[PDB]
């Protein structure tokens, strides 16, 4: 029996424990691995990546392992989880490639979570350069809940949401459902793209962990 | 205007072009188009014959045209099947494209992408991850319970390789769940024989273009 990405993400939401009032709790992170000889350069590129608005929140993880280096970046499913905790249902719809050139802002390729058994961002990882093209998710919120969403987001004070569209409106080329508002999140593994782009060879298995937000390091 | 078009809507539009009649055993079909250098014409025809003998690919027929400096290869898409079924009043809804594993004790899709939410051809992602011995490109369609008996009537009058399995109403088929009062239909990927070329050390330029071609202008195996 095949599990859809949507249902993997739903199960993942229930482990989210992040409280905005405390500014701490359990988050969902991507876990990537690199060789130990790239430790110094990776931290630098990661700091720069977070300064350039890549990834979700100001925090990421970088730990010493026996032979390799473990790097943790927060998944957008964490946002899905925080919002649910605050009575704001967000439905993840698509993952794909976001194009930002001087002229426009559009999704150029997408995969839907509902009917796929892959992480869309693992499929598009190598066709992204994090200068013109970025990994991104498309979420939907109900229009009445949209006000609460912006209030919760402001209190959250995290990098990660790129846009919130008007009810029933096309957003970055993607149409929305009846009485829904498009929410575009930045891809969590975007900072990892920049390591590849600076010749840091990334081995990414589809590994996700629940970690405490406090144990992650800020870019400041 | 920069609206994303889904794989599903590309397929509905393609169905309209299908003109194949079961009773006349001819009509317009939808093909993929692939390119190889003319050095490999001899070897490729033998592999293609073998692929179609092994029941891979859709139908018994394929295109093999002398181009200028290359050789154009044409294989029939599953969307032809969809088109053929709609013309016999059997609405077939394409759901997923993916990798079908046929192993020792398991018959399962191991990875899929949904047509209705994606702007990619799923077989374009999964082309490099199949060997055509244990793993195969495959499609998943849903047919309504009432149309099922009609579908099987049409299938046998068509007499084409392509349909791997038809499931029971409201039952999982090959690891994939099904909607309310529906039956799973597993089609084989039209570009499976193209995999065998690549696997037998033949370089192949796979193109995104699909052609509407007469069934008569293709060669039987």
UniProtKB/Swiss-Prot annotation, chain A:
GO terms, molecular function: DNA binding
Keyword line: DNA-binding, Repeat, Repressor, Transcription, Transcription regulation
Keyword Repressor: yes
Region (NRD 2): 1-220
Top-level taxon in the UniProt lineage: Archaea
Note: Adopts different quaternary structures in its active apo state compared with its inhibited 2-oxoglutarate-bound state. In the 2-oxoglutarate-bound state, NrpR is inhibited from binding to DNA because its DNA-binding domains are too far apart to recognize the operator DNA sequence.
Family the entry assigns: Belongs to the NrpR family.
Subunit structure: Homodimer.
Function: Transcriptional repressor of nitrogen fixation and assimilation genes. Binds to two tandem operators in the glnA and nif promoters, thereby blocking transcription of the genes.
Protein name: Global nitrogen regulator NrpR
Species, as recorded: Methanocaldococcus jannaschii (strain ATCC 43067 / DSM 2661 / JAL-1 / JCM 10045 / NBRC 100440) (Methanococcus jannaschii)
Covered range of the whole protein: 321 to 540 of 542
């Amino acid at each position: 029996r095949i599990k859809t990405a949507l249902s993997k993400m739903f199960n993942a939401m229930a482990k989210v424990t992040y409280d905005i009032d405390e500014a701490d709790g359990d988050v969902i992170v991507n876990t990537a691995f690199i060789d130990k000889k790239y430790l110094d350069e990776a931290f630098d590129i990661l700091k720069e990546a977070y300064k350039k608005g890549l990834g979700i929140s100001d925090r990421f993880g970088i730990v010493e392992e026996n032979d390799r280096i473990k790097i943790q970046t927060i998944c957008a499913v964490t946002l899905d989880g925080i919002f649910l905790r605050n009575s704001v249902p967000l439905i993840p719809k698509y993952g794909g490639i976001l194009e930002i050139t001087e002229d426009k802002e559009r999704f150029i390729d997408i995969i839907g979570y509902d009917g796929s058994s892959l992480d869309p961002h693992e499929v598009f990882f190598n066709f992204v350069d994090c200068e013109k093209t970025f990994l991104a998710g498309f979420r939907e919120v109900h229009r009445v809940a949209r006000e609460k969403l912006e209030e919760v987001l402001k209190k959250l004070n995290w990098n990660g949401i790129k846009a919130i569209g008007e009810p029933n409106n096309e957003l970055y080329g993607i149409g929305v459902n009846k009485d829904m508002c498009g929410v575009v999140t930045m891809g969590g593994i975007n900072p990892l793209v920049l390591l590849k782009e600076n010749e840091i060879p990334i081995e990414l298995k589809a590994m996700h962990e629940v970690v405490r937000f406090s144990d992650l390091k800020s870019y400041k």
